[PDB]
Amino acid sequence: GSAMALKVGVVGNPPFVFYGAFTGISLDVWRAVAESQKWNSEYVRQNSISAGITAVAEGELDILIGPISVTPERAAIEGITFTQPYFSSGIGLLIPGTATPLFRSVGDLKNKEVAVVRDTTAVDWANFYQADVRETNNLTAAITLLQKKQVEAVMFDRPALIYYTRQNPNLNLEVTEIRVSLEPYGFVLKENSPLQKTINVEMLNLLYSRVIAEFTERWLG
Amino acid sequence: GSAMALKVGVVGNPPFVFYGAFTGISLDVWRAVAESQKWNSEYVRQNSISAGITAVAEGELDILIGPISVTPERAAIEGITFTQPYFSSGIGLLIPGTATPLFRSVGDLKNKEVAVVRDTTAVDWANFYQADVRETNNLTAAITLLQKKQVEAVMFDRPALIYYTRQNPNLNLEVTEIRVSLEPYGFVLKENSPLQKTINVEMLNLLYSRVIAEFTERWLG
């Protein structure tokens, strides 16, 4: 098909997004959607979720894909609209195997030196839980602070932290059972986009057909 | 406030919707949304979910509230758009306390005389699971078939079935651990509605603030 390609912004971390060129759960979902409609895509990596959302609002992008949590603040941004969510996630905590007795409740976060990545929901949750927030540029930098000793824990999306531990069992780090919060992931479109209904219906088909569960099982099961 | 009232269609069963005049979890969510914006509401009971959705599409209603599952088929209807979901539900099974060993998997549904309510997702799921589908007009009629002996089980939204058993412990009926499916509930607006962003942001605020969990605890906790 010679039809104009949709400008697809991409942001996120494994197992939802990997950079080579672009793979992961989020990419498998989007591609399934694109293929069902015989759409062409032009992928553009985004610096951050906010940068990507602004790009959709300013018409620079047609859609922003990735593990983008649907929050009140993000949904309030002018010019955009979230698709129906396709994954139920949760914010978790990565700690040294010895810190386990210390992290058993969100109440325990108060006063703890917790590392967070800038422009993620964890910043707000960590601040809200009165932790000693240490803002970093990326997940790797946040974990490098833990690997060192500057922080007692890293707050970030739970699936991403679990994936990381599974690539580094040598570290003996642990993702607590603590769920700081539950957040659904969705994609972002321009408000009143003529693609919205088509995208929603397709994502819902993949959701109900267990296709998305299969994608998740590939990188997490 | 003297502002024109929004036409709010209402459909659903307890504990999400009760008819006096209109109460339940869905009503507590909508009212919280309306109050935060100082909106006036005119409630209109709808015959069925489909009838209500068509009414929103035809501009007869501004919004359809209730335990409305976001499905591919419903999202595909022209002229409407679902809000972000506010509750994660699941389709369940109500059976006689003795039928328990018989209903332990969706595979067991095949060939079983299962009662379903017309215009509910259970019809499709029951058909899909190759059950002996017995279509009824309402949940009460479906349960009256079970109470009798014409059916071996009733397939319907799990929270509603649990609520029913809790009002009738004398019956000794049981809601199996079987989850036929998982379905999110949302409200329905006219596509490209100027109220969409405001409603989404508010519903998300109530969701993240645990306010909706509190409403649910009132009628289920």
Short mmCIF file of C-alpha atoms in Angstrom, two decimals:
data_model
loop_
_atom_site.label_atom_id
_atom_site.label_comp_id
_atom_site.label_asym_id
_atom_site.label_seq_id
_atom_site.Cartn_x
_atom_site.Cartn_y
_atom_site.Cartn_z
CA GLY A 1 0.00 0.00 0.00
CA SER A 2 1.23 3.46 -1.04
CA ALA A 3 -0.82 5.33 1.57
CA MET A 4 0.81 8.06 3.66
CA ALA A 5 2.49 6.62 6.74
CA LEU A 6 1.28 7.42 10.24
CA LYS A 7 3.88 9.17 12.38
CA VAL A 8 4.34 6.89 15.38
CA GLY A 9 6.21 8.27 18.37
CA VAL A 10 7.84 5.59 20.52
CA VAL A 11 8.83 5.87 24.18
CA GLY A 12 9.24 3.38 27.00
CA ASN A 13 11.43 0.65 28.46
CA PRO A 14 11.62 -3.16 28.20
CA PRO A 15 9.70 -5.33 27.99
CA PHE A 16 7.28 -2.87 26.37
CA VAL A 17 9.81 -1.02 24.21
CA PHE A 18 13.34 -1.99 23.09
CA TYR A 19 15.58 0.19 20.88
CA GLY A 20 17.76 -1.45 18.22
CA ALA A 21 14.90 -0.73 15.60
CA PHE A 22 11.73 -0.83 17.74
CA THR A 23 10.37 -3.98 19.42
CA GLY A 24 8.53 -5.12 22.56
CA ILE A 25 4.95 -5.57 23.80
CA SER A 26 3.84 -2.05 22.82
CA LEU A 27 5.26 -2.52 19.31
CA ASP A 28 3.59 -5.91 18.89
CA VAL A 29 0.25 -4.30 19.83
CA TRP A 30 0.65 -1.32 17.51
CA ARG A 31 1.90 -3.42 14.59
CA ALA A 32 -1.03 -5.82 14.93
CA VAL A 33 -3.32 -2.76 14.79
CA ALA A 34 -1.50 -1.29 11.77
CA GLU A 35 -1.44 -4.60 9.86
CA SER A 36 -5.16 -5.18 10.38
CA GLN A 37 -5.79 -1.89 8.56
CA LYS A 38 -2.88 -2.21 6.11
CA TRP A 39 -1.35 1.02 7.49
CA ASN A 40 2.26 2.19 6.92
CA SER A 41 4.22 3.48 9.92
CA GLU A 42 7.15 5.88 10.38
CA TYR A 43 8.66 5.35 13.85
CA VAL A 44 10.21 8.22 15.78
CA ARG A 45 11.79 7.71 19.20
CA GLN A 46 10.64 10.26 21.74
CA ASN A 47 12.78 11.73 24.50
CA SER A 48 10.12 11.39 27.21
CA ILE A 49 6.40 10.70 27.62
CA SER A 50 5.63 14.41 28.02
CA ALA A 51 7.73 15.34 25.01
CA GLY A 52 5.88 12.70 23.03
CA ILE A 53 2.44 13.84 24.18
CA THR A 54 3.18 17.45 23.21
CA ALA A 55 4.32 16.18 19.80
CA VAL A 56 0.94 14.48 19.30
CA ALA A 57 -0.90 17.63 20.43
CA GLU A 58 1.14 19.80 18.05
CA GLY A 59 0.35 17.43 15.17
CA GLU A 60 4.00 16.38 14.83
CA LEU A 61 2.94 12.79 15.58
CA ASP A 62 -0.21 10.84 14.78
CA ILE A 63 0.12 8.53 17.78
CA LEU A 64 2.40 7.97 20.75
CA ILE A 65 2.85 4.30 21.64
CA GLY A 66 4.50 2.66 24.63
CA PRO A 67 3.74 1.80 28.28
CA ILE A 68 2.03 5.16 28.79
CA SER A 69 0.02 5.24 32.03
CA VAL A 70 -3.38 6.91 31.79
CA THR A 71 -3.30 9.52 34.58
CA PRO A 72 -5.52 12.55 35.36
CA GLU A 73 -2.65 14.94 34.63
CA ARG A 74 -1.85 13.43 31.23
CA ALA A 75 -5.49 13.14 30.17
CA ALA A 76 -5.87 16.82 31.09
CA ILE A 77 -3.32 17.91 28.48
CA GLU A 78 -5.02 19.91 25.72
CA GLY A 79 -5.20 18.42 22.23
CA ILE A 80 -4.80 14.75 23.11
CA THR A 81 -6.93 11.76 24.03
CA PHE A 82 -5.92 8.32 25.33
CA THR A 83 -7.02 5.12 23.58
CA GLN A 84 -8.71 2.45 25.72
CA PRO A 85 -6.04 0.86 27.98
CA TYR A 86 -4.38 -2.38 26.80
CA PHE A 87 -2.45 -3.43 29.92
CA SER A 88 -2.92 -3.15 33.68
CA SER A 89 0.39 -2.29 35.28
CA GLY A 90 1.49 -1.17 38.71
CA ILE A 91 4.32 0.87 40.18
CA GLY A 92 6.80 -1.25 42.13
CA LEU A 93 10.06 -1.17 44.07
CA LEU A 94 13.47 -2.70 43.30
CA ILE A 95 15.58 -3.22 46.45
CA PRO A 96 18.70 -5.13 47.62
CA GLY A 97 17.86 -8.67 48.71
CA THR A 98 18.59 -7.65 52.33
CA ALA A 99 16.24 -4.65 52.46
CA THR A 100 13.17 -6.93 52.23
CA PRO A 101 12.03 -6.60 55.88
CA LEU A 102 12.23 -2.80 55.53
CA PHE A 103 9.93 -2.53 52.51
CA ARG A 104 6.58 -4.14 53.32
CA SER A 105 4.13 -1.24 52.93
CA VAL A 106 3.84 2.15 51.18
CA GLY A 107 4.09 3.58 54.68
CA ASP A 108 7.69 2.34 54.80
CA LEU A 109 8.60 4.61 51.87
CA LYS A 110 8.59 7.68 54.12
CA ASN A 111 12.18 8.87 54.67
CA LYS A 112 13.73 6.20 52.44
CA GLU A 113 16.29 7.26 49.80
CA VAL A 114 14.29 6.24 46.71
CA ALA A 115 15.56 6.65 43.15
CA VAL A 116 13.07 7.64 40.44
CA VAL A 117 13.31 8.44 36.74
CA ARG A 118 12.38 11.95 35.63
CA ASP A 119 9.05 12.28 33.84
CA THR A 120 7.53 9.08 35.23
CA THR A 121 4.56 8.65 37.57
CA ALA A 122 6.98 7.31 40.20
CA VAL A 123 8.21 10.86 40.86
CA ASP A 124 4.75 11.90 42.06
CA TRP A 125 4.10 8.68 43.98
CA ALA A 126 7.51 8.84 45.72
CA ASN A 127 6.97 12.49 46.64
CA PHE A 128 3.45 11.64 47.81
CA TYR A 129 4.76 8.82 49.99
CA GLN A 130 7.25 11.24 51.56
CA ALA A 131 10.35 9.42 50.37
CA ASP A 132 13.79 10.96 49.88
CA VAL A 133 13.35 11.31 46.13
CA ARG A 134 16.50 11.06 43.99
CA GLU A 135 15.64 12.04 40.41
CA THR A 136 17.60 10.34 37.62
CA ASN A 137 17.68 10.59 33.80
CA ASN A 138 16.85 6.95 33.04
CA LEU A 139 16.12 3.58 34.63
CA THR A 140 19.72 2.43 34.10
CA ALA A 141 21.02 5.48 35.98
CA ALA A 142 18.48 4.88 38.76
CA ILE A 143 19.55 1.23 39.07
CA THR A 144 23.22 2.27 38.86
CA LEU A 145 22.55 4.37 41.98
CA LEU A 146 21.12 1.32 43.74
CA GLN A 147 23.89 -1.01 42.45
CA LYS A 148 26.19 1.55 44.05
CA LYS A 149 24.66 2.49 47.40
CA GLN A 150 23.36 6.03 47.04
CA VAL A 151 19.74 4.86 47.25
CA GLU A 152 17.84 2.25 49.25
CA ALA A 153 15.38 1.47 46.42
CA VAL A 154 14.25 2.33 42.89
CA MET A 155 10.60 3.15 42.18
CA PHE A 156 9.43 2.40 38.64
CA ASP A 157 6.87 0.38 36.66
CA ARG A 158 6.77 -3.14 38.06
CA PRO A 159 6.97 -5.15 34.79
CA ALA A 160 10.10 -3.23 33.75
CA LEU A 161 11.84 -3.86 37.09
CA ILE A 162 11.01 -7.58 36.96
CA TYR A 163 12.32 -7.82 33.43
CA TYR A 164 15.58 -6.17 34.55
CA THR A 165 16.11 -8.61 37.43
CA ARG A 166 15.53 -11.48 35.01
CA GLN A 167 18.42 -10.29 32.85
CA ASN A 168 20.63 -9.84 35.92
CA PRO A 169 20.09 -12.69 38.43
CA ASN A 170 23.77 -12.20 39.39
CA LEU A 171 22.76 -8.98 41.21
CA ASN A 172 20.32 -10.75 43.57
CA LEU A 173 18.16 -7.60 43.59
CA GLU A 174 14.49 -8.08 44.44
CA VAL A 175 11.23 -6.54 43.30
CA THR A 176 9.04 -6.28 46.41
CA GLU A 177 5.43 -7.51 46.55
CA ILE A 178 4.59 -3.87 47.30
CA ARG A 179 2.36 -2.26 44.69
CA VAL A 180 2.75 1.51 45.06
CA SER A 181 -0.19 1.87 42.64
CA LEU A 182 -2.05 0.35 39.70
CA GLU A 183 -1.89 2.11 36.36
CA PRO A 184 -3.37 1.16 32.99
CA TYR A 185 -1.29 1.65 29.81
CA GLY A 186 -2.76 3.12 26.65
CA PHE A 187 -1.64 4.95 23.50
CA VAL A 188 -2.11 8.68 22.86
CA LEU A 189 -3.86 10.19 19.85
CA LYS A 190 -4.76 13.74 18.83
CA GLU A 191 -8.14 14.69 20.33
CA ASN A 192 -10.99 13.86 17.96
CA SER A 193 -8.64 11.87 15.72
CA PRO A 194 -10.37 10.13 12.79
CA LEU A 195 -8.35 7.00 13.66
CA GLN A 196 -9.58 6.75 17.27
CA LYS A 197 -12.55 4.41 16.75
CA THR A 198 -10.60 2.11 14.43
CA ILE A 199 -7.69 1.93 16.85
CA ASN A 200 -9.93 1.40 19.90
CA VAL A 201 -11.94 -1.39 18.25
CA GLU A 202 -8.75 -3.16 17.13
CA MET A 203 -6.98 -2.87 20.47
CA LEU A 204 -10.11 -4.23 22.15
CA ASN A 205 -10.19 -7.16 19.68
CA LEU A 206 -6.56 -8.01 20.50
CA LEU A 207 -7.33 -7.62 24.19
CA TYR A 208 -10.38 -9.90 24.27
CA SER A 209 -8.80 -12.46 21.92
CA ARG A 210 -5.91 -12.98 24.36
CA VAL A 211 -3.49 -11.76 21.67
CA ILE A 212 -2.01 -9.07 23.94
CA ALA A 213 -1.65 -11.65 26.73
CA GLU A 214 0.37 -13.74 24.26
CA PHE A 215 2.67 -10.77 23.46
CA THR A 216 3.22 -10.21 27.19
CA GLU A 217 3.95 -13.93 27.70
CA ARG A 218 6.72 -13.70 25.08
CA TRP A 219 8.71 -11.12 27.09
CA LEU A 220 7.47 -11.94 30.63
CA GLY A 221 5.87 -15.40 30.83
CA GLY B 1 -26.67 26.81 38.73
CA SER B 2 -29.25 27.47 35.99
CA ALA B 3 -27.25 25.74 33.25
CA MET B 4 -28.98 23.30 30.90
CA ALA B 5 -29.03 19.79 32.35
CA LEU B 6 -27.14 16.93 30.75
CA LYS B 7 -29.39 14.08 29.62
CA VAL B 8 -28.10 11.04 31.50
CA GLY B 9 -29.31 7.63 30.37
CA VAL B 10 -29.20 4.99 33.11
CA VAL B 11 -29.04 1.23 32.65
CA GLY B 12 -27.69 -1.63 34.74
CA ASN B 13 -28.28 -3.81 37.78
CA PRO B 14 -27.25 -3.73 41.46
CA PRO B 15 -24.88 -2.94 42.94
CA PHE B 16 -24.05 -0.54 40.10
CA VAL B 17 -27.58 0.69 39.43
CA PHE B 18 -30.74 0.53 41.59
CA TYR B 19 -34.15 1.92 40.53
CA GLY B 20 -36.36 3.64 43.10
CA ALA B 21 -34.87 7.09 41.89
CA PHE B 22 -31.35 6.15 40.72
CA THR B 23 -28.57 4.93 43.05
CA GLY B 24 -25.58 2.57 43.12
CA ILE B 25 -21.86 2.59 42.27
CA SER B 26 -22.36 3.98 38.75
CA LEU B 27 -24.55 6.80 40.11
CA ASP B 28 -22.05 7.66 42.83
CA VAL B 29 -19.33 7.95 40.16
CA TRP B 30 -21.41 10.07 37.79
CA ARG B 31 -22.71 12.34 40.55
CA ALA B 32 -19.19 12.95 41.87
CA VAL B 33 -18.23 13.93 38.30
CA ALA B 34 -21.27 16.20 37.88
CA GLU B 35 -20.80 17.89 41.28
CA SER B 36 -17.13 18.64 40.61
CA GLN B 37 -18.25 20.65 37.56
CA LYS B 38 -21.49 21.97 39.10
CA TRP B 39 -23.51 20.24 36.34
CA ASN B 40 -27.28 19.59 36.43
CA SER B 41 -28.53 16.14 35.40
CA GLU B 42 -31.80 14.78 33.99
CA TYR B 43 -31.90 11.00 34.48
CA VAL B 44 -33.65 8.72 32.00
CA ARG B 45 -33.83 4.96 32.50
CA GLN B 46 -32.88 3.02 29.41
CA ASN B 47 -34.42 -0.26 28.31
CA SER B 48 -31.11 -1.92 27.44
CA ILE B 49 -27.44 -1.07 26.88
CA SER B 50 -27.88 -1.09 23.10
CA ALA B 51 -30.99 1.05 23.28
CA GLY B 52 -29.07 3.48 25.46
CA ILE B 53 -26.04 3.58 23.17
CA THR B 54 -28.21 4.33 20.14
CA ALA B 55 -29.85 7.13 22.15
CA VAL B 56 -26.42 8.70 22.77
CA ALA B 57 -25.49 8.33 19.08
CA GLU B 58 -28.77 9.93 17.99
CA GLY B 59 -28.16 12.86 20.37
CA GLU B 60 -31.16 11.92 22.53
CA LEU B 61 -28.78 11.47 25.48
CA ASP B 62 -25.57 13.24 26.45
CA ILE B 63 -24.17 10.25 28.32
CA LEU B 64 -25.09 6.66 29.15
CA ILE B 65 -23.97 5.59 32.62
CA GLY B 66 -23.97 2.18 34.27
CA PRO B 67 -21.87 -1.03 34.35
CA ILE B 68 -21.33 -0.85 30.58
CA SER B 69 -18.57 -3.22 29.45
CA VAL B 70 -16.18 -1.81 26.87
CA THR B 71 -16.27 -4.39 24.06
CA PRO B 72 -15.07 -4.30 20.41
CA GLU B 73 -18.66 -4.52 19.14
CA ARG B 74 -19.90 -1.63 21.28
CA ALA B 75 -16.89 0.58 20.57
CA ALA B 76 -17.51 -0.06 16.86
CA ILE B 77 -20.95 1.57 16.98
CA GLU B 78 -20.96 4.79 14.95
CA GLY B 79 -21.37 8.10 16.76
CA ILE B 80 -20.23 7.04 20.22
CA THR B 81 -17.04 6.82 22.26
CA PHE B 82 -16.38 5.17 25.63
CA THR B 83 -14.87 7.10 28.54
CA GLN B 84 -11.81 5.58 30.24
CA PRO B 85 -12.95 2.52 32.26
CA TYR B 86 -13.70 2.98 35.98
CA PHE B 87 -14.11 -0.63 37.14
CA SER B 88 -12.62 -4.00 36.22
CA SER B 89 -15.36 -6.60 36.22
CA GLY B 90 -15.66 -10.16 35.03
CA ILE B 91 -18.41 -12.45 33.79
CA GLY B 92 -19.30 -15.17 36.28
CA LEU B 93 -21.63 -18.10 36.95
CA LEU B 94 -24.38 -18.56 39.55
CA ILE B 95 -25.11 -22.24 40.26
CA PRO B 96 -26.89 -24.44 42.86
CA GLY B 97 -24.62 -25.28 45.79
CA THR B 98 -24.49 -28.91 44.56
CA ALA B 99 -23.37 -28.16 40.99
CA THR B 100 -19.94 -26.97 42.22
CA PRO B 101 -17.91 -30.01 41.07
CA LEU B 102 -19.47 -29.65 37.60
CA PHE B 103 -18.45 -26.03 37.04
CA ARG B 104 -14.67 -25.71 37.42
CA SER B 105 -13.60 -24.45 33.98
CA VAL B 106 -15.02 -22.62 30.94
CA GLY B 107 -14.64 -25.95 29.20
CA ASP B 108 -17.39 -27.31 31.46
CA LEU B 109 -19.87 -24.80 30.00
CA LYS B 110 -20.19 -26.84 26.80
CA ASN B 111 -23.62 -28.53 26.72
CA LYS B 112 -24.79 -27.02 30.01
CA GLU B 113 -28.23 -25.37 30.15
CA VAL B 114 -27.06 -21.81 30.92
CA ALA B 115 -29.44 -18.88 31.41
CA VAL B 116 -28.39 -15.47 30.08
CA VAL B 117 -30.02 -12.04 29.90
CA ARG B 118 -30.70 -10.59 26.46
CA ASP B 119 -28.41 -7.78 25.37
CA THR B 120 -25.55 -8.66 27.72
CA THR B 121 -22.05 -9.88 26.89
CA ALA B 122 -22.94 -13.20 28.54
CA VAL B 123 -25.02 -14.14 25.49
CA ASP B 124 -21.92 -14.09 23.28
CA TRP B 125 -19.66 -15.75 25.85
CA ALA B 126 -22.21 -18.53 26.51
CA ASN B 127 -22.68 -19.13 22.79
CA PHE B 128 -18.90 -19.06 22.34
CA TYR B 129 -18.44 -21.63 25.11
CA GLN B 130 -20.99 -23.88 23.38
CA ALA B 131 -23.50 -23.86 26.22
CA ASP B 132 -27.23 -24.51 25.89
CA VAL B 133 -28.12 -20.82 25.94
CA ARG B 134 -31.49 -19.87 27.43
CA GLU B 135 -32.16 -16.18 26.73
CA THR B 136 -34.20 -14.26 29.32
CA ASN B 137 -35.53 -10.69 29.62
CA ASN B 138 -33.81 -9.79 32.90
CA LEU B 139 -31.54 -11.12 35.63
CA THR B 140 -34.51 -11.87 37.90
CA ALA B 141 -36.12 -13.99 35.17
CA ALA B 142 -32.79 -15.77 34.58
CA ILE B 143 -32.42 -16.52 38.30
CA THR B 144 -36.10 -17.53 38.48
CA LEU B 145 -35.25 -20.19 35.87
CA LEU B 146 -32.40 -21.44 38.07
CA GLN B 147 -34.48 -21.22 41.29
CA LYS B 148 -36.90 -23.43 39.37
CA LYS B 149 -34.82 -26.05 37.56
CA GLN B 150 -34.97 -25.18 33.88
CA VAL B 151 -31.29 -24.19 33.83
CA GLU B 152 -28.10 -25.50 35.43
CA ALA B 153 -26.53 -22.03 35.78
CA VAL B 154 -26.90 -18.30 35.11
CA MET B 155 -24.14 -16.38 33.31
CA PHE B 156 -23.94 -12.67 34.14
CA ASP B 157 -21.60 -10.00 35.51
CA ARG B 158 -19.89 -11.38 38.61
CA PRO B 159 -20.41 -8.42 41.00
CA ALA B 160 -24.16 -8.45 40.31
CA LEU B 161 -24.46 -12.19 40.98
CA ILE B 162 -22.51 -11.89 44.25
CA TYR B 163 -24.69 -9.01 45.35
CA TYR B 164 -27.79 -11.11 44.65
CA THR B 165 -26.56 -14.07 46.72
CA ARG B 166 -25.83 -11.67 49.58
CA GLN B 167 -29.46 -10.58 49.64
CA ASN B 168 -30.64 -14.20 49.48
CA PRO B 169 -28.42 -16.45 51.65
CA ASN B 170 -31.56 -18.58 52.20
CA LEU B 171 -31.18 -19.87 48.62
CA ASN B 172 -27.69 -21.32 49.20
CA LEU B 173 -26.82 -20.53 45.57
CA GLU B 174 -23.13 -20.11 44.77
CA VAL B 175 -21.10 -17.90 42.47
CA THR B 176 -18.28 -20.09 41.13
CA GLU B 177 -14.61 -19.04 41.15
CA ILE B 178 -14.85 -19.37 37.36
CA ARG B 179 -14.22 -16.12 35.52
CA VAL B 180 -15.72 -16.50 32.03
CA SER B 181 -13.98 -13.23 31.12
CA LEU B 182 -12.71 -9.87 32.37
CA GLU B 183 -14.48 -6.73 31.22
CA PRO B 184 -13.88 -3.08 32.12
CA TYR B 185 -16.88 -0.78 32.73
CA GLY B 186 -17.04 2.73 31.32
CA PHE B 187 -19.63 5.36 30.37
CA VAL B 188 -20.66 6.22 26.80
CA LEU B 189 -20.53 9.68 25.25
CA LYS B 190 -21.24 11.03 21.77
CA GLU B 191 -18.10 10.78 19.63
CA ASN B 192 -16.01 13.95 19.85
CA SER B 193 -18.13 15.21 22.76
CA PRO B 194 -16.90 18.52 24.26
CA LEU B 195 -17.38 16.93 27.71
CA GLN B 196 -15.08 13.94 27.07
CA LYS B 197 -11.82 15.37 28.43
CA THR B 198 -13.50 16.84 31.51
CA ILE B 199 -15.28 13.57 32.25
CA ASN B 200 -12.16 11.45 31.64
CA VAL B 201 -9.95 13.60 33.88
CA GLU B 202 -12.54 13.54 36.68
CA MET B 203 -13.18 9.81 36.50
CA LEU B 204 -9.42 9.25 36.58
CA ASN B 205 -9.13 11.53 39.65
CA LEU B 206 -11.82 9.51 41.46
CA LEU B 207 -10.12 6.30 40.36
CA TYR B 208 -6.62 7.20 41.55
CA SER B 209 -7.88 8.81 44.77
CA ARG B 210 -9.53 5.53 45.82
CA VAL B 211 -12.93 7.28 45.78
CA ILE B 212 -14.44 4.71 43.40
CA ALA B 213 -13.04 1.89 45.56
CA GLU B 214 -14.90 3.49 48.49
CA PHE B 215 -18.19 3.55 46.51
CA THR B 216 -17.71 -0.14 45.65
CA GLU B 217 -16.96 -0.96 49.30
CA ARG B 218 -20.30 0.58 50.29
CA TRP B 219 -22.33 -1.91 48.21
CA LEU B 220 -19.85 -4.84 48.12
CA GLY B 221 -17.20 -4.59 50.85
#
